[PDB]
């Protein structure tokens, strides 16, 4: 995977949040969320994907990967989809928009999603 | 998996498109995706997460996946991730938001990001 | 403005809320919005725009608008924008994505807005 | 307007666009705003609507607002909606997240909308 290396690893949001990753030769995506916000504690698993044979013109790495909020501690009734880039070199980012929807009633369907913006760093 | 059952099997959305997935125990989604429409045929891994143990209120039952736009046949340089609730009984339905984000340059990375809407059904 | 007759008018979402406007020859869009559901109740000011030059190749017209969820009877301190695009002829629809921010708190921004998708018709 | 003082004027987001606004008394937002990316030259009228008397608590002020993309110079056959809230004090800031839909045909549809988001100052 040309990105395989470069995205395997920690990396920290703008919320003090931790995402743990590994990524596969075959573009598999696998490890643990830990959210500095919301109804939330300890580590979640996640999955997900990215483009393991990207553009060779300097354009980011696509990738996405879900969190269902159920552990062994807790269960928030809700999912999180982060969907965005890995941009290499010197300060490399992941830079992501993310949908988190809950479980609801048909009444409430409509009001079931949210919509943010994570930027991932190697630091801090 | 409390929906474990209502959830693994084949699902058609509003595009024509089929969604191919196995729920596991453990809150884990596997399977393959293939799409009507864009830059893209066969098909395509998908991996997710989704809420094994939801509300007893009639609440749905949250979950997610991605799509990474590469297989044998094509790359379209970028990854779909659906965020929705999957709606048991008579007509199940799974409701989804989802975040197409493409690889770009900085220049354009803007515009890497399409949010849309696709509902799930088990016929047609 | 080419859609201004097609877009003036009383439309109805698939929630049962209420879309009254007119469209100006210049782009504007005014008028008043009801919703049947959330912190809400009788007519919010609307404002938006249109394209009031579209494609003639058979593409929809692009448009949006905004509503304040303050009136004289309730203030849920928040905003909606739909944005979307009309089509035309003997089914005429108006299609929307749509975001609702509410005022929060610094620590509560990250769950400020939310997602949805509303399709306006001309009956029901 | 609570914020009527703090909202209107010039504005300026990461991408280097200006967004020149006056706030109403009455909720109304009305100015012009000129995009440094994308399909667009010189400026483009805006409306929106905000909250005029927002929570005590330290809450943002909830807003929105639409450009429809026709000037006399260009027609890009798409609309912006921005949907956020200002946030007071000595680093004044807008934050938002946008959909910007273009006018498609029903087979591109899928396809019509963007989502990203803009953090504008009083400076740069
Ligand atoms: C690409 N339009
Ligand atoms: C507010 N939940």
Chains 1, 2, 3, 4 share one sequence.
Do not use: C, M
Not at 46 to 72: C, E, H, M, Q
């Amino acid at each position: 995977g040309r990105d395989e290396a470069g995205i395997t690893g920690t990396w920290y949001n703008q919320l003090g949040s931790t995402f743990i990753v590994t990524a596969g030769a075959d573009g598999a995506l696998t490890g643990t969320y830990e959210s500095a916000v919301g109804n939330a504690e300890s580590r979640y698993v996640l999955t997900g994907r990215y483009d393991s044979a990207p553009a060779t013109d300097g354009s980011g790495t696509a990738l996405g990967w879900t969190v269902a909020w159920k552990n062994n501690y807790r269960n928030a009734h809700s999912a999180t989809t982060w969907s965005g880039q890995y941009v290499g070199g010197a300060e490399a980012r992941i830079n992501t928009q993310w949908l988190l929807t809950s479980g609801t009633t048909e009444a409430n369907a409509w009001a079931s999603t949210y919509v943010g913006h994570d930027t991932f760093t190697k630091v801090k």
